[PDB]
Design a protein around this ligand. Structure first.
Ligand code: GTP
Ligand code: GDP
Ligand code: GDP
Ligand code: MG
Lengths: 426, 44, 152, 429, 370
């Protein structure tokens, strides 16, 4: 009735989202061969949010899985859940994406209209209702900031009214993979401002940090690193999908958290995190989740939230919960920490409730935060741009496929003007 | 302001690694297998 | 041709499988090298007779006629509340040993028709049976007979 | 809800802490894994578990590691079991200055995390000794960092006193006299035990030749359970934990009292002869049953605190107290005509299974502040004088930060402590 | 958490350290090809002290052989070693293992004080390690010549190590003829007995005992002043093929043979000796009133002969894990005045080094005096 369309693109987005369509599988109790097995009939009445129907009770996801390689669709079908995904919506590219945002965005710009746009309008019009559009691209690669981020300006050209919600993977300098990350990620955050209202930020050092300080596992793979985000993405729609006490949705999370049309870069979190050895020794109640919620070590974008005042702060909740103390510790943390919130805005906290706890838990509280220290993410990726631009060193890959020098200067000439707004209202 | 740490949480410095039988740094949390158990979806 | 047992690879749980390592002969030190700090201390929360005297001395029988020198307790002197608001039995001198004494069938039969209660013979046999079932050792007592007659 | 924090620090306090949490767990229905098929010492989590209030901090790796692999591994929080890297080597500047300074930020949060969980907290139960670099120097780190934070609160430490005639340490009296340098400022009840008397108590009453250390951890275990019965078991005459700082210490540096526990007996002697109330308190005062090496006949008792337990009647207590205070042998002090103090509870003496004790109906615990321990301070600075004259063994304590500027400063402070058994012992007119 | 780097320097040290590794490997249950045997869980808990492991159950020591080596690898347990550090460079290998180590405490160097390889190269290499790790303890087991070269050697060594063990083959021979009735003293038997005396004091570093005292604590306990550090070993429950069934085993019985004069490693005179510090390290499952009572009873029998102006002239240690075969065992170690006779003979046998030896003899004299 309020169906959600998820656009998974890239070598990232087909291995990040490959964990995202697993917690949607068990919280609705979906078998990996299509049919539902369970007893409680609360979770098949709102099955249509994520699962279309066919004959024989079979539920396939509304899914888009695109890449310019054939590389990663030989891996998402190679997982445990590969039979669940739809057969036609793997949209192939026989060639390679090849690290550059030049190949996907302008050379493969005319290719994506036959590729992704003709599958979306086939699908998203066919639903009995719609809510919004949610895409997960890697900023530092070739398909995500190639095919995917042009589509963020393509469907938004068709339907202006809906809501864009990008769980975006911005890289960090400490854990690095490619040396030209000022050349694929800086060239996409200029496009995100006009065309994506709800813009999250995911890092790769803070995610290992959470599996070091908190879960204490010593050799974390990507699969353990991708459930701390796959719990987040499933845990934000906990009121569009289940009953409860105080339901919220993706307009009710954007009115509270976006005061200005360009002050809209959020950052995430996830409350109930405790180690592998002390499971039962911690009492998961209200005042301990909200003590995990606010500190610097828990928050998934690799920034220190103390240098910058939160303009606005959101939340969500689940589980059989008593409202009073939930609404009470968030009376304290605005009041005791008046230094780390702005003045001139009376309220800064939003809360929303559900009824069902997640699988194997009792409570949960996903965190979404608009702070004015996301400019720490966007000063370091412009600190290294013009310190590399002056030798022009890796430019000779970009004048040979169809973009000029003159659009390179404008992408950072508005990057500071983003930061010139966060700094003024600090 | 920094917040306190125990012995051998981050491992951003490079350490030699043992099998967990030998009582070494960060032995216990990898000795214990992570445990979970559920019965069904509750009611509202 | 193989054994049915193949172990995990570490004290960590759910490790990948590995074979059981062979302990060679005259190299089994498990039976000899036990520890001594916590191994001597095994008190599981999941037995012996009791030594001394009780402060009430209910285990020894009570003497019939007391000496003057007797200061050893026997429990017959009740609480001060039971001396300041006595039952009428205590008011005129019949007490709990006269309740709990073993009387006779003819004594209880003389008690029945003279205490103001008219009882059938089968009802008297049933009352004696219920009193002997109520008493653990089994006899005729005034408290047991009155309690069985009140309950049934 | 009169709770206390029960740290076990150093090696000489943790095997007792093995035996301490045996005796609390067997007393109640709590299993070793903490599932009950208590609120003083135990925090309870709603899954079905109980968690004790005890942090086991020591620099030595193996004695904590023998618990995490031991049979009591499913009891504690496994972040309370705190270990550093290298031992303190019985060196004060290693257990308080160079390796002990690395672990004090962690354990300031850990006493704060437990106390934020507790409701009606009434103090601490640290368990240390008087010879250790990590047992006597390091407990004076966990003491001065709490009175700057918690301040006025009742601290009860059970400290193995260095014996008159036996010992095993060598450079011991250099920092024992430094332990007392700050625990005069910030300790309010520092109980003490010589193990040398318990070596001979077993040889006379208990029919024991060759006793181990595992037997002495159980008898030290009972004294802790005797003083902590009035928190978990309501009695006729309660004694609570702020009352111990007005009963006992008369002048603010005389807070070092003894302990014993009278009817230590086997199963073949207790069957033969009875145990009234008027003879287990007679067995308290006899010189063959105090658990600390001392002869009380040269000492005038200042303030006993008889803790009874089990099946006792309060006229039987006061019949016995006037028989004893008329005795011409045992002497007292004239400006304390009050003298004694009783405590009567309705919970019996427990027994460990597989032990050597018998099932006695009554058992007492007298906790006598006495005079006679002053002459055991005559020998603890006489020992200090001789090493310090020739600067012997100083070459290592100066290795890790300490200097000569404190060793004479401590000796006069332990000289001034011996004087304060003479301004108060010489009677007014 | 204590650590150890073991170096065999010079020939006699090479063949005694070979028996050292054989003794620790049999006490820890490793097949000489390197595979682990795990009959009990106490064997592998602190193998990190002396070893680092390999992929597939193989283990390899923290030992460097520097100076014979083909004979050692041809011997019983040669296959365990690392063939890349057989140096004959030493600085690079010692920082390699000491940089792969986590928290270092002490070093086991096997040498002698009577020859051209164990003495000069020993002093050079102890200088080259003390210049690199100034906060560790160098247990440098040594062999000195019989009183019936070292003056060149010792006068940097007494500054550096303070953990040498110097009485020798004449005492070893007379032990073998008298208290063992052992007819043919082979060199391997003396290597065996010295190696077991090595392994006796390495159980507080590897096993959870009862009175746990590591090497830095041993240094602080034993050494009063920074130049009186030459110590005297001995291993107690040794007897013959016959006398076992005639003797009994108790703590008062092993006290007799750990203070037996014919048992100690010394061709010296405790009747002219005065022990500043004694440590008796016990291994087994033994009651401790027996230990402490027998300790101070055998100190009570001799008021003169244990040192005056020290109240506790002795120290005991005990571990919960005995040797192989024997239900309990003891190892006695002392720091007496019964050792300057060797210095007097080796000095009556450059010139400032001789003067420093005369200084050390006068140091013993002026501290034995009242
Ligand atoms: N009650 C009891 N006392 C012990 C035990 N083990 C050792 N001791 C005593 O501890 C004394 C020496 O220990 P401490 O002075 O406390 O030294 P420490 O705290 O252990 O410091 P470290 O040895 O470095 O760990 C000895 O004289 C023993 O009397 C035990 O298991 N139980
Ligand atoms: N932490 C984490 N990082 C990922 C994951 N998948 C991709 N990345 C990051 O994404 C970057 C690689 O981009 P890539 O996927 O090859 O770009 P694409 O070819 O356009 O899809 C690297 O910096 C990786 O660190 C993941 O599952 N976890
Ligand atoms: N265990 C053992 N010791 C030996 C052997 N050969 C010699 N020694 C000892 O080595 C000592 C002399 O060697 P040394 O002076 O060090 O000459 P170097 O090895 O060339 O430096 C003698 O006192 C012997 O006790 C042997 O085969 N086995
Ligand atoms: Mg220790």
């Amino acid at each position: 009735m309020r169906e959600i369309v998820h656009l998974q693109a890239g070598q990232c987005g087909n291995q990040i989202g490959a964990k995202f369509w697993e917690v949607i599988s068990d919280e609705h109790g979906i078998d990996p061969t299509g049919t539902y097995h369970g007893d409680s009939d609360l979770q098949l009445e709102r099955i249509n949010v994520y699962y279309n129907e066919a004959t024989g009770g079979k539920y396939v996801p509304r899914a888009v899985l695109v890449d310019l390689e054939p590389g990663t669709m030989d891996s998402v079908r190679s997982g445990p859940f590969g039979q669940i995904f739809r057969p036609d919506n793997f949209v192939f590219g026989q060639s390679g994406a090849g690290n550059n945002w030049a190949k996907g965005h302008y050379t493969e710009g005319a290719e994506l209209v036959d590729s992704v746009l003709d599958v979306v309008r086939k699908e998203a019009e066919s639903c009995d209702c719609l809510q919004g559009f949610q895409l997960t691209h890697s900023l530092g690669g070739g398909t995500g900031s190639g095919m995917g981020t042009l589509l963020i300006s393509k469907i938004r050209e068709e339907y202006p009214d809906r809501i864009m919600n990008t769980f975006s993977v911005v890289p960090s300098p400490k854990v690095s993979d490619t040396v030209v990350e000022p050349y694929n990620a800086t060239l996409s955050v200029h496009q995100l401002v006009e065309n994506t209202d709800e813009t999250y930020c995911i890092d790769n050092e803070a995610l290992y940090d959470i599996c070091f300080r908190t879960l204490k596992l010593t050799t974390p793979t990507y699969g353990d690193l991708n459930h701390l985000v796959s719990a987040t993405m499933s845990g934000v729609t906990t009121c569009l999908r289940f009953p409860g006490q105080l339901n919220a949705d993706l307009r009710k999370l954007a009115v509270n958290m976006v005061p200005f049309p360009r002050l809209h870069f959020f950052m995430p979190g996830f409350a109930p995190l405790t180690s592998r050895g002390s499971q039962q020794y911690r009492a998961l109640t209200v005042p301990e989740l909200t003590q995990q919620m606010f500190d610097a070590k828990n928050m998934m974008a690799a920034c220190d939230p103390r240098h910058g005042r939160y303009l606005t702060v959101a939340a969500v909740f689940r589980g059989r919960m008593s409202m009073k103390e939930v609404d009470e510790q968030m009376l304290n943390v605005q009041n005791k920490n008046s230094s780390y919130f702005v003045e001139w805005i009376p309220n800064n906290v939003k809360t929303a409730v559900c009824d069902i706890p997640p699988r194997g838990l009792k409570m949960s509280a996903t965190f979404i935060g608009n702070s004015t220290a996301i400019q720490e993410l966007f000063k370091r990726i412009s600190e290294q741009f013009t310190a590399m631009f002056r030798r022009k060193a890796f430019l000779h890959w970009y004048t040979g496929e169809g973009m000029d020098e003159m659009e390179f200067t404008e992408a950072e000439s508005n990057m500071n003007d983003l930061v010139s707004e966060y700094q003024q209202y600090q | 302001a920094v917040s306190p740490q125990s012995s051998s949480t981050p491992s951003w410095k490079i350490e030699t690694k043992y099998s967990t039988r030998v009582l070494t740094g960060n032995w216990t949390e990898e000795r214990r297998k992570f445990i979970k158990a559920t019965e069904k979806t509750p009611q509202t | 041709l193989l054994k049915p047992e193949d172990i995990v690879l570490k004290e960590p749980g759910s490790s990948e499988k590995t074979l059981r390592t062979l302990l060679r002969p005259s190299d089994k030190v498990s039976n000899h090298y036990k520890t001594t700090s916590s191994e001597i201390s095994a008190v599981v929360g999941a037995c012996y007779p009791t030594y001394g005297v009780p402060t009430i001395r209910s285990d020894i029988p009570a003497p019939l006629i007391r000496r003057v020198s007797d200061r050893t307790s026997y429990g017959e002197e009740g609480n001060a509340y039971s001396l300041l608001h006595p039952t009428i039995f205590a008011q005129k001198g019949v007490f709990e040993r006269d309740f709990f004494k073993t009387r006779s069938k003819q004594e209880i039969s003389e008690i029945l028709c003279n205490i103001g209660v008219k009882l059938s013979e089968d009802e008297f046999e049933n009352v004696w049976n219920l009193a002997s079932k109520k008493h653990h050792r089994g006899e005729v007592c005034v408290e047991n007979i009155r309690s069985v007659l009140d309950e049934l | 809800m009169r709770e206390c924090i029960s740290v076990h620090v150093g090696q000489a306090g943790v095997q007792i802490g093995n035996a301490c949490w045996e005796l609390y767990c067997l007393e109640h229905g709590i299993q070793p894994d903490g599932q009950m098929p208590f609120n003083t010492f135990f925090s309870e989590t709603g899954a079905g578990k109980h968690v004790p209030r005890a942090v086991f901090v020591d620099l030595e790796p193996t004695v904590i590691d023998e618990v995490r692999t031991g049979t009591y591994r499913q009891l504690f929080h496994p972040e309370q079991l705190i270990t550093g890297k290298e031992d303190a080597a019985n060196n004060y500047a290693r257990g308080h200055y160079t390796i002990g300074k690395e672990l004090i930020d962690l354990v300031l949060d850990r006493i704060r995390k437990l106390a934020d969980q507790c409701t009606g907290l009434q103090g601490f139960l640290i368990f240390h000794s008087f010879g250790g670099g990590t047992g006597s120097g390091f407990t004076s780190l966990l003491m001065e960092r709490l009175s700057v934070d918690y301040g006025k609160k009742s601290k009860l430490e059970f400290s193995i006193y260095p014996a008159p005639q036996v010992s095993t340490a060598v450079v011991e009296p250099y920092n024992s006299i430094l332990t007392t340098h700050t625990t005069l400022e910030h300790s309010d009840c520092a109980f003490m035990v010589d193990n040398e008397a318990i070596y001979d108590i077993c040889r006379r009453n208990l029919d024991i030749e060759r006793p181990t250390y595992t037997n002495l951890n159980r008898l030290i275990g009972q004294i802790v359970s005797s003083i902590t019965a009035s928190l978990r078991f309501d009695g006729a005459l309660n004694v609570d934990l702020t009352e111990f700082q007005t009963n006992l210490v008369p002048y603010p540096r005389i807070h070092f009292p003894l302990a014993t526990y009278a009817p230590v007996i086997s199963a073949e002697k207790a069957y033969h002869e009875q145990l009234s109330v008027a003879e287990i308190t007679n067995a308290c005062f006899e010189p063959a049953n105090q658990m600390v090496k001392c002869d009380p006949r040269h000492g005038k008792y200042m303030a006993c605190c008889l803790l009874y337990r089990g099946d006792v009647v309060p006229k039987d207590v006061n019949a016995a107290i006037a028989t004893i205070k008329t005795k011409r042998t045992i002497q007292f002090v004239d400006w304390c005509p009050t003298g004694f103090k009783v405590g009567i509870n309705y919970q019996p003496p427990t027994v460990v299974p597989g032990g050597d004790l018998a099932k006695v109906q009554r058992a007492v615990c007298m906790l006598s502040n006495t005079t006679a321990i002053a002459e055991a301070w005559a020998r603890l600075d006489h020992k200090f004088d001789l090493m310090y004259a020739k600067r012997a063994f100083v070459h290592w304590y100066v290795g890790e930060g300490m200097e000569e500027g404190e060793f004479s400063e401590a000796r006069e402070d332990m000289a001034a402590l011996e004087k304060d058994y003479e301004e108060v012992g010489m009677d007014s007119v």
